[PDB]
Enzyme design. Structure first.
Site, PDB file in Angstrom:
ATOM      1  N   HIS B  88      52.971  81.644  26.430  1.00  0.00           N
ATOM      2  CA  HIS B  88      52.223  81.972  27.642  1.00  0.00           C
ATOM      3  C   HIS B  88      50.934  81.174  27.657  1.00  0.00           C
ATOM      4  CE1 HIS B  88      54.927  85.422  28.367  1.00  0.00           C
ATOM      5  NE2 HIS B  88      54.800  85.676  27.056  1.00  0.00           N
ATOM      6  N   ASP B  91      46.032  80.235  33.937  1.00  0.00           N
ATOM      7  CA  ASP B  91      45.395  79.468  35.035  1.00  0.00           C
ATOM      8  C   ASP B  91      44.427  80.439  35.706  1.00  0.00           C
ATOM      9  OD1 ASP B  91      44.608  78.265  37.535  1.00  0.00           O
ATOM     10  OD2 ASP B  91      46.642  78.162  38.420  1.00  0.00           O
ATOM     11  N   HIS B  93      42.084  80.618  38.786  1.00  0.00           N
ATOM     12  CA  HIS B  93      41.760  79.919  40.005  1.00  0.00           C
ATOM     13  C   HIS B  93      40.230  79.813  40.188  1.00  0.00           C
ATOM     14  CE1 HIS B  93      45.817  80.459  42.312  1.00  0.00           C
ATOM     15  NE2 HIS B  93      45.980  79.880  41.123  1.00  0.00           N
ATOM     16  N   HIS B 128      46.752  83.616  36.657  1.00  0.00           N
ATOM     17  CA  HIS B 128      48.124  83.807  36.346  1.00  0.00           C
ATOM     18  C   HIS B 128      48.563  82.905  35.193  1.00  0.00           C
ATOM     19  CE1 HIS B 128      49.444  80.085  38.266  1.00  0.00           C
ATOM     20  NE2 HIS B 128      48.575  80.374  39.242  1.00  0.00           N
ATOM     21  N   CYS B 129      49.618  83.350  34.526  1.00  0.00           N
ATOM     22  CA  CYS B 129      50.287  82.542  33.533  1.00  0.00           C
ATOM     23  C   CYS B 129      50.983  81.370  34.246  1.00  0.00           C
ATOM     24  CB  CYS B 129      51.242  83.453  32.780  1.00  0.00           C
ATOM     25  SG  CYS B 129      52.219  82.582  31.549  1.00  0.00           S
ATOM     26  N   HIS B 138      57.176  83.225  35.075  1.00  0.00           N
ATOM     27  CA  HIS B 138      56.157  84.095  34.468  1.00  0.00           C
ATOM     28  C   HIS B 138      55.410  84.864  35.563  1.00  0.00           C
ATOM     29  CE1 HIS B 138      56.105  82.812  30.078  1.00  0.00           C
ATOM     30  NE2 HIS B 138      57.202  82.219  30.620  1.00  0.00           N
ATOM     31  N   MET B 143      53.002  88.350  35.572  1.00  0.00           N
ATOM     32  CA  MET B 143      51.991  87.856  34.680  1.00  0.00           C
ATOM     33  C   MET B 143      50.859  87.195  35.464  1.00  0.00           C
ATOM     34  SD  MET B 143      52.574  86.245  30.957  1.00  0.00           S
ATOM     35  CE  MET B 143      51.162  86.198  29.849  1.00  0.00           C
ATOM     36  N   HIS B 248      46.755  96.160  55.281  1.00  0.00           N
ATOM     37  CA  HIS B 248      46.379  97.016  56.376  1.00  0.00           C
ATOM     38  C   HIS B 248      46.132  98.419  55.831  1.00  0.00           C
ATOM     39  CE1 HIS B 248      46.459  98.310  60.610  1.00  0.00           C
ATOM     40  NE2 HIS B 248      46.731  99.480  60.049  1.00  0.00           N
ATOM     41  N   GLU B 272      42.114  94.599  61.623  1.00  0.00           N
ATOM     42  CA  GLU B 272      43.203  95.550  61.489  1.00  0.00           C
ATOM     43  C   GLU B 272      44.039  95.207  60.260  1.00  0.00           C
ATOM     44  OE1 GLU B 272      46.215  95.608  64.856  1.00  0.00           O
ATOM     45  OE2 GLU B 272      45.240  93.691  65.405  1.00  0.00           O
ATOM     46  N   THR B 273      44.371  93.919  60.174  1.00  0.00           N
ATOM     47  CA  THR B 273      45.292  93.364  59.206  1.00  0.00           C
ATOM     48  C   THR B 273      44.793  91.949  58.927  1.00  0.00           C
ATOM     49  OG1 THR B 273      47.080  94.619  60.235  1.00  0.00           O
ATOM     50  CG2 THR B 273      47.711  92.783  58.785  1.00  0.00           C
ATOM     51  N   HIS B 299      51.576  94.881  55.852  1.00  0.00           N
ATOM     52  CA  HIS B 299      52.053  95.264  57.175  1.00  0.00           C
ATOM     53  C   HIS B 299      53.217  94.410  57.654  1.00  0.00           C
ATOM     54  CE1 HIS B 299      51.932  97.175  61.131  1.00  0.00           C
ATOM     55  NE2 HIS B 299      50.958  97.987  60.759  1.00  0.00           N
TER      56      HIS B 299
END
Ligand SMILES: [Cu+2]
Ligand SMILES: [Cu+2]
Ligand SMILES: [Cu+2]
Ligand SMILES: [Cu+2]
Ligand SMILES: [Cu+2]
Ligand SMILES: [Cu+2]
Lengths: 333, 333, 333
Positions: B88, B91, B93, B128-129, B138, B143, B248, B272-273, B299
């Site tokens: 494993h 990363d 971001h 994330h892996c 993964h 992960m 939502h 709303e969303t 939603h």
């Protein structure tokens, strides 16, 4: 005391038209009264004659656009006639509390209810049916629409200057999931209960069989094309209660777009295409500059041209050769 | 000289809870120390008892929310115990260089590593892996998690005024691709190597079998519903490491939303969303106005109610009949 | 009188490179002359040797990036040689009227046409073929590209300060729908007419078989990786004519992003990942801070690593251990 406020009764119209309203509020806050009658009905949704059991507000897919101003009260009388077979309710994304009203508006056939909510936030918003345990089934059977809550002083551009539309249309986009047999043909169903499991299976593919504007392939074409004139300012409200879309005016733009539909935000300018997330209403303002036929689409062009998410504008007026011209018409080498 | 800086050890908590932090930085820049232990484990993800071989940071899907301030250094001790079978890495971001740290954090079972990066950009971010050649496997095995890098002076609204949350939750949304046989039943696998090709096939359908919050259908319901009180300001951080979502709050709004999660941008108001693109974390700030049960969903309501992407808030307090009321309760015509 | 304006002939280059231009306009408005020659051709799109009948502008997928300034006129000579078999045309999302030019540019094999339009709106925009009745087929056969309409005073950040790129690349992302037999293998076709129904069926799955940058799996890798140096400012224009994407620089960011590509809007800062809706071009500006290999992906990581939507940057320069370092390299417990 809400009883001290003016009451105004709205008489709704069928999409893509929109009931009469004022952009800038000509009164103080009001209780704005709406009545919608639920109708379960068969609808033919494509050129092949595919017929579904639709679930509608007021007989249409989408349900009608309701229009109020910020800090008005929306008072909806929701009627479920005993000619229907299912329980229904309503979630207003514009409202605060009780699952958007859904927890308070459960009506069996032969019942009605009246919900009031304060429209505290300006924007276009989805409303949809949402009965516990069968929410996506109702929504993807057509049982959704939109409500526009205008700022009391109407719309503004990114600099705070007024934007005033001359015409407004409401495009409701519907993803349908008509169950298919293994060979790929649509199945038919005797009762909503018998249909339910195959509806769920079909929904769980996440692949709509049909994606349509105003309830059917071709509904906003021909004699039912949207219209405008060169120089007219048009607001197109577009909703998708369940699935993302990406509207595009082929030959035009969204001059000012609220892609996620909320008017306290400055609009995005000059959009080619914009993403309205599923569960959202958006609004695009455009001033037409050229006459002719436009196509208004979901710009997943498969969804538009194969699955149904395409309508037309017919625009009248003068052609502007400075803005576009054929210098040399198609001809042989 | 980073050695001259304070070091602070963070003790992580399981989602949807978030470790203790200060919104406004009470110290100068720090090296903020985190330890996560990779755990491969079986998880039951639905009501049917479907069991998958999950790949986790710190035993949970999602992995825990890490919180620092802009221009802190994040120092992660990543431990891959020899009870695991796979390689494993991670990363971030939020980080700059070496594939987000992925190129520097490849740990076989029985190894550990320590990565440091400067958190130069404020926002919520996915981590994330991402092992070369098996990245989506993964990630879609669970992960992934998120890290929030707060501005040193905390959050601000669109006018530069402070936004201070009272409570924070982290909703990690996971698309799983459990392989199916031709009849549609989930397959089971003896070893990760034997599972791999069918995992790839299943992923390539681009159709998740399950989409869940906090690692399972119903994980944020019942005794594990999110909670709040009327009048409380709540920040909901939501991540999706692989696939778009559209959160939502049913019955509420996102009063202030950073849909793509980066706090140097003004928030969008009154959503709303909102669309959180796959590979992104977003954040929504809401002040509750009504008590009761809310549902917090993706939603795409099929994804929510059929595939699992739904949780609940239980909110305590006073009901406000001015904001919403049943004028006439459901009753017979 | 457009005849009184300067004419400048542009000589296009193959993506991901971009023809020479000035960010800040060094002349007044011009008629900017472009010629593209349609080429139908076989293309191998993956490592397996899958060969499709591509439909191209100027021999490439995507077609070349065209660059002008706001209020220039774009004059395109579009040539359909008689070595082709199909009718084609072009919709410029930058243009106003006649379906983006599509209604005016229908060319049979052996014909050419010249279209002029005024580029009234600044931004990056999709252009694509769109023949009535076969629009998604042409587009998803590769027949699309982009045009950048720069503000006359070049790009600006969210505060109105100049953003000047040192290098520009154009990443066209293509969803292909290669028809499959029931066992899942790609089918092959004798004529475009014989291919058409199976193409439509394949498109209607809404599940691409391939999603690629610059026309093939691995096209922007190896000797064709994108390049940059530490400290260089890079603009990556990214288009998707038919389907949403979510670009991400693995190890970097979008320092300034116009996700929906229109430069009259302030950019979003510090994006990890951004959604470019299908039918849109977007642009991300990044200043590299670290050397090494980066991967530039659609962060649906299945779409990236299994279906093809991944390219690389090779960046030269100094490593910055303050920004990221391995404190303890992977080693045994
Ligand atoms: Cu209903
Ligand atoms: Cu809803
Ligand atoms: Cu892993
Ligand atoms: Cu990533
Ligand atoms: Cu073509
Ligand atoms: Cu188009």
């Amino acid at each position: 005391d809400i009883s001290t406020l003016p009451r105004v009764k709205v008489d709704l119209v069928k999409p893509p038209f929109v009931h009469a309203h004022d952009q800038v509020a000509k009164t103080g806050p009001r209780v704005v009264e709406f009545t919608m009658t639920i109708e379960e009905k068969k609808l033919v949704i494509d050129r092949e004659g595919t017929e579904i059991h639709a679930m509608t507000f007021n007989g249409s897919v989408p349900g009608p656009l309701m229009v109020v101003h910020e800090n008005d009260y929306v008072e909806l009388r929701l009627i479920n006639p005993d000619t229907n077979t299912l329980l229904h309710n309503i979630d207003f994304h514009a409202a605060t509390g009780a699952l958007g009203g859904g927890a308070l508006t459960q009506v069996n056939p032969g019942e009605e209810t009246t919900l009031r909510f304060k429209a505290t936030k300006p924007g276009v918003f989805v409303y949809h049916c949402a009965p516990e345990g069968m929410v996506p089934w109702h929504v993807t059977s057509g049982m959704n629409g939109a409500i526009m809550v205008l700022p009391r002083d109407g719309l503004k551009d990114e600099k705070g200057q007024p934007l005033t539309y001359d015409k407004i249309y409401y495009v409701g986009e519907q993803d349908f999931y008509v169950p298919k047999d293994e060979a790929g043909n649509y199945k038919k169903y005797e009762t909503p209960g018998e249909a339910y499991e195959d509806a769920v299976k079909a929904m769980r593919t996440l692949t709509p069989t049909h994606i349509v504007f105003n309830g059917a392939v071709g509904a906003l074409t021909g004699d039912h094309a949207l219209t405008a004139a060169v120089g007219e300012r048009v607001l197109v409200v577009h909703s998708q209660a369940n699935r993302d879309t990406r509207p595009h005016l082929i030959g035009g733009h969204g001059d000012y777009v609220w892609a996620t539909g909320k008017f306290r935000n400055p609009p995005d300018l000059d959009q080619e295409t914009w993403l309205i997330p599923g569960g959202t209403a958006g609004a695009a303002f455009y001033t037409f500059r050229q006459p002719g036929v436009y196509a208004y689409v979901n710009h997943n062009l498969i969804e538009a041209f194969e699955l149904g998410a395409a309508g037309h504008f017919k625009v009248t007026g003068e052609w502007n050769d400075d803005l576009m011209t054929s210098v040399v018409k198609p001809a042989s080498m």
